[PDB]
Amino acid sequence: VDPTHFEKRFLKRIRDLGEGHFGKVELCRYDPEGDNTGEQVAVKSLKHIADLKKEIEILRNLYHENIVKYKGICTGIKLIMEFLPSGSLKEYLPKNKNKINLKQQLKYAVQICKGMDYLGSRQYVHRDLAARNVLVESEHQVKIGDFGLTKAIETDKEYYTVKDDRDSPVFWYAPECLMQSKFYIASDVWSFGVTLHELLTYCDSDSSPMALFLKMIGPTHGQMTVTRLVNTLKEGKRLPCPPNCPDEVYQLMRKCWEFQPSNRTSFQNLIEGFEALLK
């Protein structure tokens, strides 16, 4: 018997956890005994097969306490992951403000950075780092929860050149990704800076990177939105300091948003910077 082999017949659909354009994740019960006592699992399916197969192979081989656990496959193929009942920071933060203070926020930040630095050391760029993809394991632990856009960087090359970019999360993206479709580890650092802004605003929809940028550049530009975004970033405009966020935290955030990738902070430097603020 293979414990990572999940039979489709026992995999009971409960609800949607999220989706992209081509894939979806659902909460399911794997219930082989049929009595509703089976384990809850997160199941990723296509709504492209080769891409999901690559994602499975990446995730199966990542081992870090801040990276969501692979459980198996169902075979067309589905990825089976651990289900985290507290959900993402998007669900958790708005419901738990009273519980979660700046110190815990900075601990989550460190954990995301550690997860990401592990990923980078395996020569991967993530390309989709955002609060909605950060899972809450407990009040004291988070995990990177999705790897749908994750790509290997070729050895002795510094970046991945993207071809499919229709559904890019532009408001989380560094200027080089917007302008040239080149994706660096430094590009993941930029995205982390935005993700940190979300964490500091408790994922409030009205303070979201999209809502805020569209206020800055104008919401009615259609196909010209990305050029206007790039232009606004060229001018040196950035997301503003979240309420109640100390300038020292905001400055670490700003080093994530240097225009040139070469001048950005790294995940190692962020971890040092946050750990210093904690003790």
Ligand X SMILES: CC1(n2cnc3cnc4[nH]ccc4c32)CCN(S(C)(=O)=O)CC1
| Residues with catalytic roles | 128
Question: Is 44 assigned a ligand-binding role in the annotation?
Answer: yes
User: Taking Cα atoms as reference points, which of 119, 39, 24, 34 lies closest to residue 78?
Assistant: 24
User: Which range, of 13-21, 182-190, 194-202, 226-234, touches ligand X by CB under 6 A?
Assistant: 13-21
Q: What would the x/- binding string for ligand X be over residues 14 to 53, using CB under 6 A?
A: ---xxxx----x----------------x-----------
180 burial (CB, 10 Å; 0-12 / 13-18 / 19+) is exposed
Per CB under 6 A, does 144 bind ligand X? no
DSSP secondary structure code for residue 2 in this structure: -
Count the residues of the shown chain that bind ligand X, applying the rule CB under 6 A. Answer: 19
Q: What would the x/- binding string for ligand X be over residues 51 to 90, using CB under 6 A?
A: -----------------x------------xxxx--xx--
Per CB under 6 A, does 173 bind ligand X? no
Smallest distance, ligand X to C-beta of residue 89, A: 10
Estimate to the nearest angstrom the gap between the alpha carbon of 184 and the chain centroid.
Answer: 15
Q: 3-class DSSP state for residue 9?
A: helix
Per CB under 6 A, does 115 bind ligand X? no
Q: Which two tokens stand for residue 49?
A: 């097969």
Positions in the binding site for ligand X (CB under 6 A): 17-20, 25, 42, 68, 81-84, 87-88, 132-133, 135, 145-146, 148
Summarize the annotated binding site for ATP as residue ranges.
Answer: 17-25, 44
